[PDB]
PDB file of C-alpha atoms in Angstrom:
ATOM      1  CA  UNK X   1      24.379  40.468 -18.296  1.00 10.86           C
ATOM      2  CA  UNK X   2      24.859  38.475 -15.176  1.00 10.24           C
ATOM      3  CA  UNK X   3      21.398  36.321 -15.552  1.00 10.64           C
ATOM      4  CA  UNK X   4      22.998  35.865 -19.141  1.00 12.46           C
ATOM      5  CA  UNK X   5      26.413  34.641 -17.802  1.00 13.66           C
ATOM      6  CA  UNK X   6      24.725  31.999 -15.886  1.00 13.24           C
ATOM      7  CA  UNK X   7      22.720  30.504 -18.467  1.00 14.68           C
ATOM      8  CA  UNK X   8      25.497  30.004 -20.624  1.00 14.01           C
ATOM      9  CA  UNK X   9      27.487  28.140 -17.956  1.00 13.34           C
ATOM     10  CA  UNK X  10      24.650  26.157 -17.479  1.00 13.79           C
ATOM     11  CA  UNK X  11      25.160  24.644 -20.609  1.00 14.74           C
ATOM     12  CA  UNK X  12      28.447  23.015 -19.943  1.00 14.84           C
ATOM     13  CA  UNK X  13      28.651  22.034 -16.234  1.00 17.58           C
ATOM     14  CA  UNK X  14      27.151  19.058 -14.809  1.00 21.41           C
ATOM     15  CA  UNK X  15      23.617  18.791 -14.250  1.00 21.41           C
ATOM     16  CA  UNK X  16      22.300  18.614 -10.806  1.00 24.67           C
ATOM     17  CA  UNK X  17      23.839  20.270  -7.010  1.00 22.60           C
ATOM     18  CA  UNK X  18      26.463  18.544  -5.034  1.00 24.78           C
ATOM     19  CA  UNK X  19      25.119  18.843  -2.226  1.00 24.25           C
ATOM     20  CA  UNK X  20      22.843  16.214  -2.764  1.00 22.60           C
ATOM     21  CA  UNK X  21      26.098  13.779  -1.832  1.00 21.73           C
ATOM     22  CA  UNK X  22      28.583  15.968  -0.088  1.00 23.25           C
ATOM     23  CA  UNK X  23      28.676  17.035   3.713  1.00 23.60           C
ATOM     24  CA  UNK X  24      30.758  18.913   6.113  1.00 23.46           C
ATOM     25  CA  UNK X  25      31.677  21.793   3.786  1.00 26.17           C
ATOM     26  CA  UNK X  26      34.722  23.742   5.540  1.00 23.51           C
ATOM     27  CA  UNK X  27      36.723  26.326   3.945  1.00 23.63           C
ATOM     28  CA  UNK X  28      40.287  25.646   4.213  1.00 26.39           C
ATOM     29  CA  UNK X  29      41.195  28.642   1.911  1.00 25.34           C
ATOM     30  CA  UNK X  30      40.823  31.487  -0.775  1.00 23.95           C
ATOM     31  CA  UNK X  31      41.637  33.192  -4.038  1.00 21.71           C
ATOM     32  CA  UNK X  32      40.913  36.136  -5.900  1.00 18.59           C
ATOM     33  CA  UNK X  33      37.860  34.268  -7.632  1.00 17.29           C
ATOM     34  CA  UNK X  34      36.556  32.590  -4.900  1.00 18.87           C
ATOM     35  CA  UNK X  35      36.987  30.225  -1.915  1.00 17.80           C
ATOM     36  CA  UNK X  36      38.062  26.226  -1.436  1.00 19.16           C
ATOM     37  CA  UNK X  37      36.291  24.127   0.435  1.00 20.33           C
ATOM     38  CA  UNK X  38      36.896  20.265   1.812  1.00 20.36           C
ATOM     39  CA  UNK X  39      33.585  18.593   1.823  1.00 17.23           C
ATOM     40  CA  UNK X  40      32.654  14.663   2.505  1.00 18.33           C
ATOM     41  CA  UNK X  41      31.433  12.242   0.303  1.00 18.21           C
ATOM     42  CA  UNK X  42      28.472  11.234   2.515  1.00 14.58           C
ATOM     43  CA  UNK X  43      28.249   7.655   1.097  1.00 14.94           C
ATOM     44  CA  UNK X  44      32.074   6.907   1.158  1.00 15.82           C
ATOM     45  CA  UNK X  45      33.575   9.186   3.745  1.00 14.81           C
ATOM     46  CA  UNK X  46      36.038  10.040   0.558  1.00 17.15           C
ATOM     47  CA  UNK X  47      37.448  13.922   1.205  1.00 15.80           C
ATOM     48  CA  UNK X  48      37.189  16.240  -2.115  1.00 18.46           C
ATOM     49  CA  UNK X  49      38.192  19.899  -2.493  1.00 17.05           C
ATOM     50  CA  UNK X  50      34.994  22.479  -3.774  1.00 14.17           C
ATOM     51  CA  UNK X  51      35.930  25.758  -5.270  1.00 12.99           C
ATOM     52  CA  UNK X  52      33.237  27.545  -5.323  1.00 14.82           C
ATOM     53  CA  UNK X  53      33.203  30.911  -7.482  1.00 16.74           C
ATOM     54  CA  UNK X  54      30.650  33.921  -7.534  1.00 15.41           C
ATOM     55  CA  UNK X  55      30.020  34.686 -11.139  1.00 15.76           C
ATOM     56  CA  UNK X  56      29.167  38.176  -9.597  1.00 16.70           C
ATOM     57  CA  UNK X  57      32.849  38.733  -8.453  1.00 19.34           C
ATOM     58  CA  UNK X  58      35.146  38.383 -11.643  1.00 20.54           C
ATOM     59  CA  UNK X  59      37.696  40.826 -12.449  1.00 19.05           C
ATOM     60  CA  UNK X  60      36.938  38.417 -15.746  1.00 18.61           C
ATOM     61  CA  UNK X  61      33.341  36.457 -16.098  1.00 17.42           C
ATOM     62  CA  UNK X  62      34.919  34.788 -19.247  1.00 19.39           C
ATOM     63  CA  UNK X  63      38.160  32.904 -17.624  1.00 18.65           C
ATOM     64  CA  UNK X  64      35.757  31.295 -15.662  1.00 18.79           C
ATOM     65  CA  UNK X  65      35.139  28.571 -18.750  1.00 20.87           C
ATOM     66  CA  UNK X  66      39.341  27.827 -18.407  1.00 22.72           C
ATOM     67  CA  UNK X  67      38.432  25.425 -15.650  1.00 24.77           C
ATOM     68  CA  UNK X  68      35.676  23.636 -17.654  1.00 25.72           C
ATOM     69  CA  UNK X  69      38.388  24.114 -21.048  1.00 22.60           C
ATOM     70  CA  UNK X  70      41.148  22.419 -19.156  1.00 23.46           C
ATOM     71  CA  UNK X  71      39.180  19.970 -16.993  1.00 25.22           C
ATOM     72  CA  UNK X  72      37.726  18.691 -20.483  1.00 23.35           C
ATOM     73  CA  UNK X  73      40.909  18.882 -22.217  1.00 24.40           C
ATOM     74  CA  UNK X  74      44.319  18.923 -20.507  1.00 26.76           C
ATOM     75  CA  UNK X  75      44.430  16.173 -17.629  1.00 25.35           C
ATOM     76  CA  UNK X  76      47.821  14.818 -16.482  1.00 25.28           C
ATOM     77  CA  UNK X  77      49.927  13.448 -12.758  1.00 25.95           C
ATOM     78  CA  UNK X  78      51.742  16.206 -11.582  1.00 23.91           C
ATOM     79  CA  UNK X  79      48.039  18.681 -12.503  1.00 26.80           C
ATOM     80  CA  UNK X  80      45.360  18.692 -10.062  1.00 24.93           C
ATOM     81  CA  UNK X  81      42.293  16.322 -11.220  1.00 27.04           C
ATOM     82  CA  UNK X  82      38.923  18.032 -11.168  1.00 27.31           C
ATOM     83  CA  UNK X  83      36.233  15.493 -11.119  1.00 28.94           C
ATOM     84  CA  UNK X  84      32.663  17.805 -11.870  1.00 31.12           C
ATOM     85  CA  UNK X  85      31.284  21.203 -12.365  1.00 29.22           C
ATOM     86  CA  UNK X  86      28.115  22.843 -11.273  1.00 32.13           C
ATOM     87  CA  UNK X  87      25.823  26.113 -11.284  1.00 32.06           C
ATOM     88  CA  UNK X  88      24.662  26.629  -7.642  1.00 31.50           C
ATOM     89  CA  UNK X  89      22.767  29.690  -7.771  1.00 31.60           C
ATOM     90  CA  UNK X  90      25.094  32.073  -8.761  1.00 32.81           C
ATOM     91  CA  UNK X  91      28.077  30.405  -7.853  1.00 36.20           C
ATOM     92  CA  UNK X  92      30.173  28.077 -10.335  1.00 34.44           C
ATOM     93  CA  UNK X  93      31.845  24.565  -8.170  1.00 31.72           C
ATOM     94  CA  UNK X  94      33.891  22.962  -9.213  1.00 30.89           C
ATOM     95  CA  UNK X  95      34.413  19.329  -7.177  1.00 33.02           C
ATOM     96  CA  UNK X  96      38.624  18.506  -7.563  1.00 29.09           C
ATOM     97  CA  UNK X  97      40.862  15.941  -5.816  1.00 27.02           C
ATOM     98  CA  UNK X  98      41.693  17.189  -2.025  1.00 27.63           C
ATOM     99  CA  UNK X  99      45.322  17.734  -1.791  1.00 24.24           C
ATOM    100  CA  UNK X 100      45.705  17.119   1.785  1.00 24.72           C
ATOM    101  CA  UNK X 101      49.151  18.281   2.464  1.00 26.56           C
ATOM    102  CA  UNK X 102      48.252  21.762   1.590  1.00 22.61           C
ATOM    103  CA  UNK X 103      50.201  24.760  -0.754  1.00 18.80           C
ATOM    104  CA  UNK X 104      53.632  25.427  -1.224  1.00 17.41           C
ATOM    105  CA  UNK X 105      53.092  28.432   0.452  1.00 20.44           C
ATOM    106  CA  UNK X 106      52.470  27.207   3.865  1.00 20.40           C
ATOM    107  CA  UNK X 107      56.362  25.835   3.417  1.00 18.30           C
ATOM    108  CA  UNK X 108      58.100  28.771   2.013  1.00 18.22           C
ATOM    109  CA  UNK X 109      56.788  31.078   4.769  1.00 17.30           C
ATOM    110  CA  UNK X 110      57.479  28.536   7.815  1.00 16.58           C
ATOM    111  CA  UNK X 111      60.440  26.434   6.726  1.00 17.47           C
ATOM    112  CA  UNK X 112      63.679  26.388   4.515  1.00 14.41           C
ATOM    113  CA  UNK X 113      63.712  23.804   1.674  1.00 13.66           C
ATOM    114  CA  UNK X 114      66.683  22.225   1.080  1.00 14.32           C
ATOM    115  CA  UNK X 115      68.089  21.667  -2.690  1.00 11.12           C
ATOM    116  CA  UNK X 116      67.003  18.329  -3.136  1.00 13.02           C
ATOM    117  CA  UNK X 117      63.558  19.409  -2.406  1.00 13.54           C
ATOM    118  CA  UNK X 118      63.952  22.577  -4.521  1.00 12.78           C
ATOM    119  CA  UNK X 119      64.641  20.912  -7.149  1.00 12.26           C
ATOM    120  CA  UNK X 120      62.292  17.969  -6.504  1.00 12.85           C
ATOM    121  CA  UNK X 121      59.481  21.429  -6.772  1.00  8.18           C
ATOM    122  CA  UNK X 122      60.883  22.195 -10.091  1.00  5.57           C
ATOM    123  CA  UNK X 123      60.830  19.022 -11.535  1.00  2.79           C
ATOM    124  CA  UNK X 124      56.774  18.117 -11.135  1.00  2.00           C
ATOM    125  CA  UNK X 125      56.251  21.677 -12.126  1.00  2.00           C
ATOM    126  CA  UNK X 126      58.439  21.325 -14.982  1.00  2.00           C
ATOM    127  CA  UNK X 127      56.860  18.099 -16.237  1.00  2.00           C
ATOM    128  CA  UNK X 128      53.754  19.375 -15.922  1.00  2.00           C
ATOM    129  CA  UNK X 129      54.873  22.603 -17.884  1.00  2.00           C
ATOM    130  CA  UNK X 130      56.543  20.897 -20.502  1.00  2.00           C
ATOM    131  CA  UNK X 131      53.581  18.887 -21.544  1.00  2.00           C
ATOM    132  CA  UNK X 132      50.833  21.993 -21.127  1.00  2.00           C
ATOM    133  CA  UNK X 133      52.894  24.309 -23.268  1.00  2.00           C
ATOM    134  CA  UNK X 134      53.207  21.321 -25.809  1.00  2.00           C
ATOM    135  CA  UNK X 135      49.347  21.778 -25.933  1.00  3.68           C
ATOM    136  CA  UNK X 136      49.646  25.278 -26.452  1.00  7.35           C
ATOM    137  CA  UNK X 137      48.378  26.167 -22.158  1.00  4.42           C
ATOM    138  CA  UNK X 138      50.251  28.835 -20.559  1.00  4.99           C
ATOM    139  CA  UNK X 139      49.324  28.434 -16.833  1.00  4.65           C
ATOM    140  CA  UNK X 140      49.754  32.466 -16.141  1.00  5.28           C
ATOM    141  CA  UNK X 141      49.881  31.875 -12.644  1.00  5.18           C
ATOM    142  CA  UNK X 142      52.873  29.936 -11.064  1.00  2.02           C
ATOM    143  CA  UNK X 143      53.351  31.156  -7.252  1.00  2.92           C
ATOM    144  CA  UNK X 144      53.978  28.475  -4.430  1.00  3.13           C
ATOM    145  CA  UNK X 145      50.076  28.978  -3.582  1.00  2.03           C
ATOM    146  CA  UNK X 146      49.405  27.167  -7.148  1.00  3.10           C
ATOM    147  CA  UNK X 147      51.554  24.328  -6.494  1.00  3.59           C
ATOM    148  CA  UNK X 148      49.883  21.586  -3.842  1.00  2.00           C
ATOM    149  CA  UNK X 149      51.347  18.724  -1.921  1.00  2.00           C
ATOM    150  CA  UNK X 150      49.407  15.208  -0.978  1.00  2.16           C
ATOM    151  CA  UNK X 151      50.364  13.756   2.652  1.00  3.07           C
ATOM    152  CA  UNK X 152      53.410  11.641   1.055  1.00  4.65           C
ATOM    153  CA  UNK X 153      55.122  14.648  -0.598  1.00  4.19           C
ATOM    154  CA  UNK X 154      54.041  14.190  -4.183  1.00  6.00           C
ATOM    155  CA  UNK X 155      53.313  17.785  -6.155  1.00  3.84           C
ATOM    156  CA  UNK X 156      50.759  18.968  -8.299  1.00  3.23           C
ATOM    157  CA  UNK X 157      49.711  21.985 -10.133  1.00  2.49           C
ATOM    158  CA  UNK X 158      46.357  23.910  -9.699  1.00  2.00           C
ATOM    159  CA  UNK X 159      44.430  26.568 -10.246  1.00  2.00           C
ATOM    160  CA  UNK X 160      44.109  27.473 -13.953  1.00  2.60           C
ATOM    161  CA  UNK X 161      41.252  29.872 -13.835  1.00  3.19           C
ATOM    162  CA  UNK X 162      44.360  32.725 -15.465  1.00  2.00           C
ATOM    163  CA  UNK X 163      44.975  30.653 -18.166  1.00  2.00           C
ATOM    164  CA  UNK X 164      45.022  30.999 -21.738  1.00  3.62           C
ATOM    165  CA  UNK X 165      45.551  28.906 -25.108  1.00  3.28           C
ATOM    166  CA  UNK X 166      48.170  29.723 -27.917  1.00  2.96           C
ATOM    167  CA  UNK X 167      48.358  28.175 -31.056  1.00  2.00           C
ATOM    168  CA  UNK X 168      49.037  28.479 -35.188  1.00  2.00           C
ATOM    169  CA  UNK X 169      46.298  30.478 -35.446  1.00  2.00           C
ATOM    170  CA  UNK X 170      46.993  32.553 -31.994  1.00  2.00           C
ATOM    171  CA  UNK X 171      50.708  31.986 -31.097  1.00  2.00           C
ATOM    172  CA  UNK X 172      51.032  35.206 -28.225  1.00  3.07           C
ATOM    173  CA  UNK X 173      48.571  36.533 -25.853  1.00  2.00           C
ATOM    174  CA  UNK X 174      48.117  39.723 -24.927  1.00  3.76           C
ATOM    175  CA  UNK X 175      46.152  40.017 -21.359  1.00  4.24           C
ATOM    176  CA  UNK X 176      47.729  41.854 -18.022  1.00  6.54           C
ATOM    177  CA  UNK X 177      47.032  38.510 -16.400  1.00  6.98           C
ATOM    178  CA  UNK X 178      48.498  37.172 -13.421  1.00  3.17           C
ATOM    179  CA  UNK X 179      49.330  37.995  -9.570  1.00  2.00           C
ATOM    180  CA  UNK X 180      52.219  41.502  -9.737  1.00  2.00           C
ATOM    181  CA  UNK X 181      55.244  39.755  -8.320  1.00  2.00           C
ATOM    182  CA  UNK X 182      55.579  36.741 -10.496  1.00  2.00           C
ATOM    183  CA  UNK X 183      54.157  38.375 -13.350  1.00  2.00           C
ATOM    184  CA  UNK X 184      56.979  38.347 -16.410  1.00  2.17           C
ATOM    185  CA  UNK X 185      58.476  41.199 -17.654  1.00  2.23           C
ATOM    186  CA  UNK X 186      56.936  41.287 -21.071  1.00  2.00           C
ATOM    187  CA  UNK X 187      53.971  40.642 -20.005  1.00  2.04           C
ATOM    188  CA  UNK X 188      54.046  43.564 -17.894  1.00  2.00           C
ATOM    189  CA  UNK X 189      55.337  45.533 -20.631  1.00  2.72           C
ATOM    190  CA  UNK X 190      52.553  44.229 -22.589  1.00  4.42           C
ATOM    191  CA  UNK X 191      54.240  42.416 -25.209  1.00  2.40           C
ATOM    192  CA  UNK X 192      52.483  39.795 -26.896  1.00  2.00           C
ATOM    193  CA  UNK X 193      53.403  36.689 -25.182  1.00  2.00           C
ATOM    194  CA  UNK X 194      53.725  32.940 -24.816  1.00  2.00           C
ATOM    195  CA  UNK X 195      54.360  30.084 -22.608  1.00  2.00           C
ATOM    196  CA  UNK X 196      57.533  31.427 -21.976  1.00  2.00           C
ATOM    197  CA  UNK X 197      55.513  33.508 -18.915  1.00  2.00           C
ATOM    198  CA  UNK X 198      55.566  30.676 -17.145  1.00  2.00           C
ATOM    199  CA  UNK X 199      59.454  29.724 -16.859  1.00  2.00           C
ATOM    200  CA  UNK X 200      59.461  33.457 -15.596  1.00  2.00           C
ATOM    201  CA  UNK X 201      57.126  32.857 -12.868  1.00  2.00           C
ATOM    202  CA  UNK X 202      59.067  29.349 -11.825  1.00  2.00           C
ATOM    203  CA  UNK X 203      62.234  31.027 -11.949  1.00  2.00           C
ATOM    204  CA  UNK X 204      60.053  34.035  -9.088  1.00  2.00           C
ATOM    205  CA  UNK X 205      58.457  30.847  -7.133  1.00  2.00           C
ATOM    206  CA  UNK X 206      62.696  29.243  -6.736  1.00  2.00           C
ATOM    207  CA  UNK X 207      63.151  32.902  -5.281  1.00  2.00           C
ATOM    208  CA  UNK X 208      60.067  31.912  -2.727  1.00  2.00           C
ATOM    209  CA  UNK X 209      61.782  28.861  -1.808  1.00  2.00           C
ATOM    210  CA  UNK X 210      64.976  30.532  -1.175  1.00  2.00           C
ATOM    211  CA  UNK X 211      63.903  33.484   0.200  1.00  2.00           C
ATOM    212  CA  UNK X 212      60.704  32.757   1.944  1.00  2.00           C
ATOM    213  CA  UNK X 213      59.057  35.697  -0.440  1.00  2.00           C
ATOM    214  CA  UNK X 214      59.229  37.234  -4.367  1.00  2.00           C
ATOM    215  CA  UNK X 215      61.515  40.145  -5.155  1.00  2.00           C
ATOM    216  CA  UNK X 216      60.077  43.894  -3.821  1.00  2.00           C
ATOM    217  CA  UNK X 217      57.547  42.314  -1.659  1.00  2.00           C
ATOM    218  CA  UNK X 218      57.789  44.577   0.624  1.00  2.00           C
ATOM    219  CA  UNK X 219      56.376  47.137  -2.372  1.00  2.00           C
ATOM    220  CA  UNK X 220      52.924  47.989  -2.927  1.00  2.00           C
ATOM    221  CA  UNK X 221      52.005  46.063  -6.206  1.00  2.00           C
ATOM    222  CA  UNK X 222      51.934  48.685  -8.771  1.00  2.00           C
ATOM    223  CA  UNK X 223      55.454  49.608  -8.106  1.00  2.00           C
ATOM    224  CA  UNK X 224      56.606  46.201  -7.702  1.00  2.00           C
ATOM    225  CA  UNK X 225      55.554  46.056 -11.625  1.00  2.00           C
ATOM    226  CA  UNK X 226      57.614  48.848 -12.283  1.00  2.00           C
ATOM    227  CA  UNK X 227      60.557  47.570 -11.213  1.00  2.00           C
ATOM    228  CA  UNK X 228      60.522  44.069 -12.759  1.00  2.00           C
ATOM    229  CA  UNK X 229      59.353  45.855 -15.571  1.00  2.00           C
ATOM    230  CA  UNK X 230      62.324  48.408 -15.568  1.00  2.00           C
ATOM    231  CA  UNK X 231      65.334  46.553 -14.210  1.00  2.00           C
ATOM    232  CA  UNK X 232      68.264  43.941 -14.284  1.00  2.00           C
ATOM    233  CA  UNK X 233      66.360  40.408 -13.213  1.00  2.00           C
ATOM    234  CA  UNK X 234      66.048  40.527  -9.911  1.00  2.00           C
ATOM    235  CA  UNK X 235      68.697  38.690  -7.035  1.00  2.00           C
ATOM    236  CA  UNK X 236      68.132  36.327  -4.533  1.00  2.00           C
ATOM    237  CA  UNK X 237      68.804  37.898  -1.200  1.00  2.00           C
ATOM    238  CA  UNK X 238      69.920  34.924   0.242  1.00  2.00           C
ATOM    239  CA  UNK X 239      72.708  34.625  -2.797  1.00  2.00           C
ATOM    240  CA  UNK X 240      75.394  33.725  -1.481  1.00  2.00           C
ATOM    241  CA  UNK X 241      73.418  30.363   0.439  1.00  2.00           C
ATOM    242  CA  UNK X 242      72.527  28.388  -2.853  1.00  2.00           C
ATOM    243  CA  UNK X 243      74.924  26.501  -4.593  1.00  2.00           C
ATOM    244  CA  UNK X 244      76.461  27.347  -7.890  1.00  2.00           C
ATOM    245  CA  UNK X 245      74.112  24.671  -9.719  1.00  2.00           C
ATOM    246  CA  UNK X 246      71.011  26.248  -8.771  1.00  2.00           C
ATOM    247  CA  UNK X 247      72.337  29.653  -9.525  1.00  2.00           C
ATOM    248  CA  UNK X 248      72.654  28.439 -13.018  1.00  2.00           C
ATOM    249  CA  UNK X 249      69.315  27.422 -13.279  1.00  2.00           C
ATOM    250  CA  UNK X 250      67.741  30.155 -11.776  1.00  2.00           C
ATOM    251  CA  UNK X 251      70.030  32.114 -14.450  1.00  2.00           C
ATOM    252  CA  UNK X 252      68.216  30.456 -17.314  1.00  2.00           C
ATOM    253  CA  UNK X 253      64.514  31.394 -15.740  1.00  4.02           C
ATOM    254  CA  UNK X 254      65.031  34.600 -15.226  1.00  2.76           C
ATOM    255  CA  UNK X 255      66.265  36.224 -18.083  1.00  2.00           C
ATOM    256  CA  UNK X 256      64.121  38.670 -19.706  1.00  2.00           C
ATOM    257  CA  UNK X 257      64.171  38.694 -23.221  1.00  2.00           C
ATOM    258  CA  UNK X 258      61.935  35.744 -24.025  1.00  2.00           C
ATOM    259  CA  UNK X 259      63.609  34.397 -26.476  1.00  2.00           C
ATOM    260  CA  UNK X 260      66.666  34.174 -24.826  1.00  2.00           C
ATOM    261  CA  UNK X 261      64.806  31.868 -21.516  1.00  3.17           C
ATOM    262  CA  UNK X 262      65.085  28.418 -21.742  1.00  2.00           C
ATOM    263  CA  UNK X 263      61.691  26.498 -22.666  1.00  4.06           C
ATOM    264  CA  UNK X 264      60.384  23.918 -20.011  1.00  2.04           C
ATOM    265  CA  UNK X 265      61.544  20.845 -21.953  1.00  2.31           C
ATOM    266  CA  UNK X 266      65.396  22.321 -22.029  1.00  2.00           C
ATOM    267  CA  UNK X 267      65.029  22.663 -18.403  1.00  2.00           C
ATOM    268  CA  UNK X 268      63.913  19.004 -17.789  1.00  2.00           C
ATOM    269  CA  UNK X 269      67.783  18.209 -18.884  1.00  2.00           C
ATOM    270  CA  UNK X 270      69.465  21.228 -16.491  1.00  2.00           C
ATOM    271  CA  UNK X 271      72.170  19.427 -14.045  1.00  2.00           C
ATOM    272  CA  UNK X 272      70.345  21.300 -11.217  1.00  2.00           C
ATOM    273  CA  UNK X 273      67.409  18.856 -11.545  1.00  2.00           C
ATOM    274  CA  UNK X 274      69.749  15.780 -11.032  1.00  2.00           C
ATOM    275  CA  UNK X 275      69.571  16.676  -7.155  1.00  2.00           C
ATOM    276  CA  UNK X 276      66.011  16.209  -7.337  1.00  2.00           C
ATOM    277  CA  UNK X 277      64.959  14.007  -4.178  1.00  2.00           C
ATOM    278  CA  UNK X 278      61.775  11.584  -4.129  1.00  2.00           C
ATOM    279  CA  UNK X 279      58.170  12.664  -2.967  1.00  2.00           C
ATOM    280  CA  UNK X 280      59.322  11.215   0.242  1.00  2.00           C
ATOM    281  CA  UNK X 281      61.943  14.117   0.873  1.00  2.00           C
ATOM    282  CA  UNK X 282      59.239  16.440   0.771  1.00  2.00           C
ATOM    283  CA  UNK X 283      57.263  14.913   3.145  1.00  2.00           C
ATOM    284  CA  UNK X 284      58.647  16.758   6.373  1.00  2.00           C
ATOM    285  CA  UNK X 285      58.148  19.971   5.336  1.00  2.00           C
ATOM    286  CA  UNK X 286      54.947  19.691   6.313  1.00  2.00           C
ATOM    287  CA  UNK X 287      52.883  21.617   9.078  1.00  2.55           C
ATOM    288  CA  UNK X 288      51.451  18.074  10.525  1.00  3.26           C
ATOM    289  CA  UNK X 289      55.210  17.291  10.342  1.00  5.34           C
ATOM    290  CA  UNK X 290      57.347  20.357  11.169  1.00  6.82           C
TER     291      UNK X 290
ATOM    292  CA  UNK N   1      52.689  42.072   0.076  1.00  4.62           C
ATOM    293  CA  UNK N   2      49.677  41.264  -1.565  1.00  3.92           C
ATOM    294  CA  UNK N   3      48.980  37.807  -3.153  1.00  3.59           C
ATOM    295  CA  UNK N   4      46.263  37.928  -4.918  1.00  3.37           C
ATOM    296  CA  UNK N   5      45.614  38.399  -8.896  1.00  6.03           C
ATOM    297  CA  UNK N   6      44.955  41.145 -10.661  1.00  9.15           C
TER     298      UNK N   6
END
């Protein structure tokens, strides 16, 4: 089935191998279905990011078309551009922007945001929310090491190989997709679900930047999914630190009847998101900046 | 505190 697999990818990525016009391949990171590169455009000197993905290694062969479904299909200024796809041997790449500033991540374990840049966070990723679940896309994957920076603080979504499409004639998903922390409650219960996954997840990722981790992460992952799956939403432990505005918001994330959650394009009009600062205020967060 | 998918 695997010499299958490729053949049928072959038929929508690019034709041709990369390497042909890119140099200096380092890796500068990983996932679960593969590993990130920065590479050179030899004739430019122009940096790109490569994912490059075994089709050998998939928990799921099949997401692997979401990146060649939403590269086609769902482009937009606060989500990551990816420029080409290719089959090299039996590894999909896929050639993106280079976000040069790095992941959330690298902030919310170093540093502590302030509000302004919380909610500066929340506003890109809401933007970008409101217009993919417009489109029926439910990202299935918000953490801080989805969301990337560029050197002057502006903030982008990435990595939609978890995602999944909804529509009239398939409003709710069903799939156990998504990494056990930040995964929704329903989800986890294995309801069928929608886009509403994702204001979840946000509402687990304003926990990272408050906290510096998600809720029982201290917990191997099987029991963390218990307990989001069992109990009252879970509290910041820094609480009493935030101010009563973004306690309100984080109220409306984390509730856990679905229905009940506020929608990304309600959330785009919370008061919380009025202390949103500019790209600039993000800018010394930064490890080339700390 | 593991963060990959599943």
């Amino acid at each position: 089935s695997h010499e299958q697999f490729r053949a049928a990818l072959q038929l929508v990525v690019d034709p041709g191998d990369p390497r042909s016009y890119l140099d200096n391949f380092i890796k500068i990171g990983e996932g679960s279905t593969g590993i990130v590169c920065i590479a050179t455009v030899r004739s430019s000197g122009k940096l790109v990011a490569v994912k490059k993905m075994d089709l050998r290694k998939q928990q799921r062969r099949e997401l692997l078309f979401n990146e060649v479904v939403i590269m086609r299909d769902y482009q937009h200024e606060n989500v990551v551009e990816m420029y080409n796809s290719y089959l090299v041997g039996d590894e999909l790449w896929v050639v993106m922007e280079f976000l040069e500033g790095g992941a959330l991540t690298d902030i919310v374990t170093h540093t502590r945001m302030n509000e302004e840049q919380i909610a500066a966070v929340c506003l890109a990723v809401l933007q970008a929310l409101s217009v993919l679940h417009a489109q029926g896309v439910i990202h299935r994957n918000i953490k801080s090491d989805s969301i990337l920076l560029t050197h002057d603080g502006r903030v982008k979504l990435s990595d939609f190989g978890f995602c999944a499409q909804v529509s009239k004639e398939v409003p709710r998903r069903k799939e156990l997709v998504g990494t056990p922390y930040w995964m929704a409650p329903e989800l986890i219960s294995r309801l069928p679900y929608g886009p509403e996954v994702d204001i979840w997840s946000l509402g687990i990722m304003v926990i990272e930047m408050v906290d510096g981790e998600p809720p029982y992460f201290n917990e191997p992952p099987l029991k963390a999914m218990k307990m989001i799956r069992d109990n009252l939403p879970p509290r910041l432990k820094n609480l009493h630190k935030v101010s009563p505005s973004l306690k309100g918001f984080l109220d409306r994330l984390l509730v856990r009847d679905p229905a009940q959650r506020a929608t990304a394009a309600e959330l785009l009009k919370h008061p919380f998101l009025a202390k949103a600062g500019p790209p600039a205020s993000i800018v010394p967060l930064m490890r080339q900046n700390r | 505190r593991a963060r990959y998918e599943m």
